[PDB]
Amino acid sequence: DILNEEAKIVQALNNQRELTIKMHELKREEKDYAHSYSPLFSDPVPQGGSIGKAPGSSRE
Amino acid sequence: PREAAAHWVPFEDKANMPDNVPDVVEVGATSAPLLSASYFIGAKCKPYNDDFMLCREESQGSGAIDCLKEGRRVTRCAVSVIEDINKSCLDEFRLHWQCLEQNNHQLSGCRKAEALLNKCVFTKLNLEKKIPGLRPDEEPVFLKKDPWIKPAVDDFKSVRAYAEAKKNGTL
Numbered sequence: 001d002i003l004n005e006e007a008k009i010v011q012a013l014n015n016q017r018e019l020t021i022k023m024h025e026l027k028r029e030e031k032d033y034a035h036s037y038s039p040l041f042s043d044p045v046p047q048g049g050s051i052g053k054a055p056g057s058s059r060e
Numbered sequence: 061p062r063e064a065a066a067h068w069v070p071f072e073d074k075a076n077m078p079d080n081v082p083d084v085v086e087v088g089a090t091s092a093p094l095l096s097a098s099y100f101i102g103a104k105c106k107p108y109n110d111d112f113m114l115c116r117e118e119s120q121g122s123g124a125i126d127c128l129k130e131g132r133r134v135t136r137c138a139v140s141v142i143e144d145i146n147k148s149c150l151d152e153f154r155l156h157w158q159c160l161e162q163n164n165h166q167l168s169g170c171r172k173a174e175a176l177l178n179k180c181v182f183t184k185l186n187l188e189k190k191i192p193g194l195r196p197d198e199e200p201v202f203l204k205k206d207p208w209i210k211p212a213v214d215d216f217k218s219v220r221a222y223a224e225a226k227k228n229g230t231l
Binding site: 055056058059060 | 113114116117119120121123
């Protein structure tokens with residue numbers, strides 16, 4: 001019984017170690033533009049001013 | 061593009077166009093006759109103007125050098141309409157742009173000459189003046205009678221010609 005209890009405690013401690021390493025790795029994963037900056041207007045490409053819009057100024 | 065700043069000099073380029081590029085006529089009208097003809101040019105040359113602008117957009121940066129043939133079409137159509145005006149409706153066209161030259165290039169100052177010009181161009185060229193984007197409720201201003209805004213001096217020759225046309229029955 002002593003061995004079983006100690007092993008259960010050690011298993012919970014290893015679970016906590018695994019969780020800590022997992023959160024460390026996830027926090028360092030790069031996020032999508034919607035999640036990191038803007039979830040509704042999700043296109044990073046600007047349009048600029050609309051007044052004298054010149055045919056041929058748009059470039060992909 | 062911004063206008064030039066503190067010190068600038070104008071410089072002319074003496075080279076010729078590269079011979080590969082087909083030559084084209086250039087429009088010879090100045091600002092007042094062009095403003096007088098602008099609506100007729102729009103009416104006739106809309107497809108070519110639209111094609112030229114669409115080419116420029118699709119070229120995505122190289123538009124000047126990629127749309128030269130489309131630009132050639134645009135300029136030829138403009139020259140054709142101005143030639144037709146010079147052949148069939150020159151007196152009224154001259155009335156209109158001389159009036160414009162007296163009225164700071166404001167169309168509201170030249171409605172009497174413009175009425176004759178529009179009737180002539182419609183009867184002999186089948187072009188119509190029309191303002192895009194209005195609802196049927198909205199009235200185009202150039203067709204409005206009794207406008208709020210009037211010229212300081214109604215143009216002399218234009219007043220006489222308008223009255224004469226009203227006698228003749230043309231207008």
